[model samples]
Every structure is written in C-alpha cells, then in structure tokens.
Target chain A: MDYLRELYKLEQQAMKLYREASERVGDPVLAKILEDEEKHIEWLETING
Target chain B: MDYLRELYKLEQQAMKLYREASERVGDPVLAKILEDEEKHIEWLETING
Candidate 1:
C-alpha cells in the first residue's frame, strides 16, 4: 500500500496546484479540471483510507 | 493558457508515475488511479489542444 499512500499524497499536491491555477485564470475548462482533481483525490482516499 | 499548458505537462508526468506504480504493485486501486490519470491527461489536452 506504500504506492497507494504515495499516490494519495501526490493527488493532494496536484489538487493544490489545480486549485491555484483555476483561481488565477477564470477559465471554465480549468475549473472543470480542478473539479476532476477533487474527484481524483476522493478516489485516492477511498483506495488508501 | 500557460497554466493549462503547465497542467498538461504535469498530468503527463503524473501518468508516467502512475503507470510505473501500477506496474510495480498490481493493486486494483492503483490501476484505477492510473485510469483516472489518463482521463485527466485527456481533459488537459482538450483544454489546451
């Protein structure tokens, strides 16, 4: 589960960057990506939680 | 579009790591993450393509 744990951390870090980018530029596409990133974090949590 | 371009690169790099982890560990959860990472890449492509 080490890799899953590591992936979970990685997704969280990605989410932070996505959020920052989404806020900086008010693009709907980027917003959607930010939303997808949140789902990815949830998936990782389900896997590692 | 600089952020989108950067995000595209980021997703591609993340996919490489996810693919490596999936191959290394053979975990269903990791596999799912790898799949999701692919989708993320595609979304980024759509945004920046």
Candidate 2:
C-alpha cells in the first residue's frame, strides 16, 4: 500500500474521534481533546501539504 | 467533572485508534474507517467552530 494512503487512513481515524468528542461539548474532556485534535490535524496537514 | 473533559477523553480514544489504524494501513477496512473519521470531523468542526 502507498505510504500516503496509509497516512491518510490514520488521519481519518483521528478525525472521526475528534468529531465524536465535539458532539459532547458538554464534556470538557472531549471538548479539549477535540481542540488538540484539530490543532494536531493542522500540523499533520501542513507536513503533507 | 466538566463536560469538556469527558469529551476530550473520547477524542483521545479516537485519536489513539486512528493512530493505530494508520499503523495498520495493511488493513483496508481500518484505513477506510479512518478516512471517514476525518470527514466526519470536518462536519463537526463546522457546526461547532
């Protein structure tokens, strides 16, 4: 499998979990996690982009 | 417990899974799931952010 393809796949997983965590904004744990998740995603995208 | 904290924990879990899935890109199934996970995260972010 292509390296890019695998990396993209892993990114997707991170994205999904962050979304779920966002839903429970009421839960501070998930909210903060999502924040970091988004931040982390940004860094990852920059690396590849 | 704050609502945000719980949510962050869940997000962390998702991040962990995605990271794992990325490693196991050998499994297309996991790879695809991670992809969707990222897309879903986008939607969630739009609504909340």
Candidate 3:
C-alpha cells in the first residue's frame, strides 16, 4: 500500500487503542485522549476525501 | 507530576512525532496529520488551563 493508505490504517488502529484504553480506565484523562484521537481520525477522513 | 502534566507531556510527544513524520514524508497527508496533531495540542492546553 501507499504511504497515505498505510498512515490511514495506522491512525485507525491508534484510534481503536485510544478508545479501548479510555473504556478500560474510565477516566476523564482517557476521555481527553480518546477525543484527540477522534479528532485525528476526522482530519484523516477529511484529507482522504 | 500530575495527571494533566503527564497527559500534556504525552500530547507533546505525539505532536513531536507527527512533526517529525511530516518532515520525513514531505507529503500533504503528513501535513494534514501534523495539523491535526497541533489541534490536539491546542485542545489539551485549553483543557489543562
């Protein structure tokens, strides 16, 4: 796969990890991390478009 | 260090990695990633404040 595609996949995996971590910890800090991860995913989707 | 500080440091490390990746890749996709990273940094700062 190309660089962009690879990066996109990596970002998705990272987002999943962030979500799992937040769910496991149930902390506001984890929520914040998850929020940022979602933001990154949104931006990536936009760029992909 | 406090939770906020630890989170801030983690965010900073993430931003630095994004920046470095952007510099190395020299692609618009990387730039988009870096932009998202910066937005995350700004959000962290606001939440911390």
Candidate 4:
C-alpha cells in the first residue's frame, strides 16, 4: 500500500529529524517531543508489520 | 526557524495523508493514528509558537 509505505517513511523521517533536533536543542521540551516521535515510530512499525 | 517550519509542514503532510487514508480505509487503527497526528500537530504548534 502506497499510503502505508509513504506514511511509514514520512514518520521515520520525522523521527530522525526530531532525534537530531532534540540532540541539538538540549532542551527538555525537545526531548519530550523526541520521546513522542519514538512512540510514533513504533506505531508506524506496528502498522507496517 | 526553518526546522520548525519544515517539521511543522512535514507533520501537516503526514496528517493530511493519514486523514485521507483513514477515510478510504475506514479502519479503526487509521482513525486512531489520525487522532494521534492531531495531537502531534498541536504539540508542534505549541513548540513553534
């Protein structure tokens, strides 16, 4: 499914960007966002699998 | 602010795609994902503002 693939890939990129941003930010809020991104990534993984 | 702009834009796209996909799929899971995307979008809005 293109939607599934695209959605999954999009989420991975978001997570990647958030991970980098959180690292650069060194802020608690960014860290929290990154944590949510991780959850989003896991959700995508679950959806894809 | 490019990161914020890009991340926010990316999330909008993700939410759009998911919204469309959920409509087409009419699945509970996609609906749940869309709800989560809304939360993520609001979070980004909060962060960006």
Candidate 5:
C-alpha cells in the first residue's frame, strides 16, 4: 500500500517534469516530449485501474 | 524563488518518470524516452546556469 502511493508520486513526478519542460521550451521536441509523457500518464492510469 | 523551485521539481519529475517507464517497458521506445528525458534534464540544468 505504501508503494502504491509511491507509484502515484513517481508517476506524478514524471508528469510534472514533462509539463515544466513543455512550458520551458519551444521546439518540435516540445510536441514529442508532451506526447511521450501522455503515454506515460496512460500507462499509470492503466496500472491504477 | 517559488517558480525556480517549481522548475527544479518539474525537471526531476520527468526524469523519474522516464526512468521508471524505461525500467517497466521492454522496447526501443524505452531508450528513446529515457534519452529524451535526459535532454529535458540537461535543458533544466542549463536554465539554472
């Protein structure tokens, strides 16, 4: 149970980075980073589901 | 100071996710994700420079 929250925090941590990176930069990579982070979010949702 | 801290947190977050996801999934994309996240990390470090 402790680790479940750990997972949540880890997942949240990644999302936050992707988001900040997205905001911090302007480039083609911006779209790719956001897209990749979205998939990471989806996987976390699946695990929690 | 507040936003700088926010950025720091964000960079760490993305790196965490990419690392986790890289470990969880077995695919070339895992490497790509990790690589991209590394670039994001580099960007963040440079920003504070």
Candidate 6:
C-alpha cells in the first residue's frame, strides 16, 4: 500500500535526519541511531512490503 | 492501505495457519504457543503498509 502513517513517516524522517547528523557531526551516537533506524526500516518494510 | 494489507495477506496466512492449528489442535499448550506467533504477525501487519 502507498498509505503512509504519520508516525511511521515521522520515524522515517527521524532516521534520515539521524543519518545526516551522523554524517555531518561525525557522532557515534547519531550513527547508532541511524543503525537502529535501519532495523526500524526493516520492520516497516516487512509490514509494508 | 489496501495494497499493504494485500501483501500482508501472506503473512496473515501464516498467522491464520497458526491460528487454525491453535483452534484445531485444541491443546492449551499449543494454543499458548501460537499466541506468540499471532503477536508476531500482528507486528508484521503493522509494518507492511
């Protein structure tokens, strides 16, 4: 489905922001968040796919 | 969304199969075990869209 839940989209945005933060600030914490985001994306993908 | 739910139908089959087992086997232990699997599918359904 092309439907996007608001919270889910928010999480995706957060992931993107964290990824950029990791790249820009070179912070491991941000990178860790990005890693977690990937896992979250996997969960989302499983549901959406 | 209709699209995601359609895809989720496969996972739902697994869920339903597990549910049918829970229903047909009529074993408390089996039913208890299947409960967790149902939970897993619930999570899967949530993400697919």
Best by lDDT: 4
For B1-49, candidate 1 gives per-residue lDDT tens digits of 5666665665676777877766665668767766767767776677564
TM-scores, each model vs. reference: 0.65, 0.36, 0.48, 0.77, 0.44, 0.39
Where is the poorest 10-residue window by lDDT in model 6 chain B? B3-12
Interface RMSD of each: 2.4, 10.3, 5.1, 1.8, 4.8, 13.4
Q: Candidate 1 regions off by >4 Å?
A: A1-9, A42-49
- Each candidate's B-chain TM-score, in sequence, is 0.73, 0.52, 0.63, 0.76, 0.58, 0.39
DockQ of each: 0.42, 0.08, 0.16, 0.56, 0.20, 0.03
Q: Which lDDT tens digits does candidate 2 get at residues A1-49?
A: 2334444455456557556645554545445544655644554455444
Off by over 4 Å in 6: A1-4, B1-49
Off by over 4 Å in 5: A2-25, B1-5, B14-36, B43-49
Cα lDDT tens digits for candidate 5, A1-49: 1223554565466566656755555545545655656765665555554
Candidate 3 TM-score versus the reference: 0.48
- What value does the lDDT take at residue B45 in candidate 4? 77
- How would the docking of model 3 be graded? incorrect
| Model 4, CA-based lDDT | 0.72
* Residue-by-residue lDDT tens digits, candidate 4, B1-40: 5567777777788888887766676667777776867777
lDDT tens readout by residue for model 3, A1-49:
1434555565565555556655554557556666657767675566555
Which has the better lDDT: candidate 3, or candidate 5? 3
Clashing pairs in 1: none
lDDT of 1 by residue, A1-49 (tens): 4755666656776777778876666667666767767767776666543
In CAPRI terms, model 5 is classed as incorrect
In candidate 6, what fraction of native interface contacts survive? 0.00
List pairs with backbone clashes in candidate 6: A1-B3, A1-B4, A47-B47, A47-B48, A48-B47, A48-B48, A48-B49
Please tell me which predicted candidate would have the highest DockQ against the true structure: 4
Per-model C-alpha lDDT, please? 0.68, 0.49, 0.59, 0.72, 0.56, 0.46
State the lDDT of candidate 6 residue by residue for A1-49, as single tens digits: 4432432554555455544544545545444444644644554456455
